[PDB]
Amino acid sequence: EVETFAFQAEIAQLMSLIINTFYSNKEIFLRELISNSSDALDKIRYESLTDPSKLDSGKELHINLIPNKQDRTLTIVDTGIGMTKADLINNLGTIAKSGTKAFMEALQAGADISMIGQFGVGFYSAYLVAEKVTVITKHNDDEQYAWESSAGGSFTVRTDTGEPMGRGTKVILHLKEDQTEYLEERRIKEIVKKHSQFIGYPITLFVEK
Numbered sequence: 001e002v003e004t005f006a007f008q009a010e011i012a013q014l015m016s017l018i019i020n021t022f023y024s025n026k027e028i029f030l031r032e033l034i035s036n037s038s039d040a041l042d043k044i045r046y047e048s049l050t051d052p053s054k055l056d057s058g059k060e061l062h063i064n065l066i067p068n069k070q071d072r073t074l075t076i077v078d079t080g081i082g083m084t085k086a087d088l089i090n091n092l093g094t095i096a097k098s099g100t101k102a103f104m105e106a107l108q109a110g111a112d113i114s115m116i117g118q119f120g121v122g123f124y125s126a127y128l129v130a131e132k133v134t135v136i137t138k139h140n141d142d143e144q145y146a147w148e149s150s151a152g153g154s155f156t157v158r159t160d161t162g163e164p165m166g167r168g169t170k171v172i173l174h175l176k177e178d179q180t181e182y183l184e185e186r187r188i189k190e191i192v193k194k195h196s197q198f199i200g201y202p203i204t205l206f207v208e209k
């Protein structure tokens, strides 16, 4: 059973600006997703400080980068707090409406797209390199759900029947045809070292056969 939702008009405008603006520094998408993962890991760690049972769904707190050249997907996995269904529908746990409004006023006032993370809507930078984004998430207080959007003003939410995650979030980037460089090991390592050297969680870059 698949539910189709319309993006709020401001979020649809943010997504089309990310997709249509000529802007060569696309690699910052990975810094933004890793930083989101770090924030999600910070949240579950803080909750575990007064309730250790919050980690019954998984004691390890990490970030995995899984490239797959056959599927042409880059997957960012974290074992953070995850998102409920309401969180997914409500712009994936962000205040995206007010964040987009501030971001667009900054762009007309000199800012560039690399600054998107300062306005709390860094997730949507995924559409700099992805034609379609799938978000699989599991929160302790809800079931596993799958969020998906190819932009175009709508997204879908369904119960995920795939591989159980325990707890955390999985961002699957179905990359554009001309953006497969972000599946190469040395390019991913370069970006992680350049923009994510101070992330307080182990970032493991998977290799392929």
Ligand SMILES: OCc1ccccc1OC1CCOCC1
Binding pocket: 036, 037, 039, 040, 043, 078, 080, 082, 083, 092, 093, 094, 123, 135, 168, 169, 170, 171
């Ligand atoms: O796993 C991190 C993540 C993945 C996809 C979308 C958003 C997102 O980050 C939100 C803010 C941090 O915590 C709540 C979720």
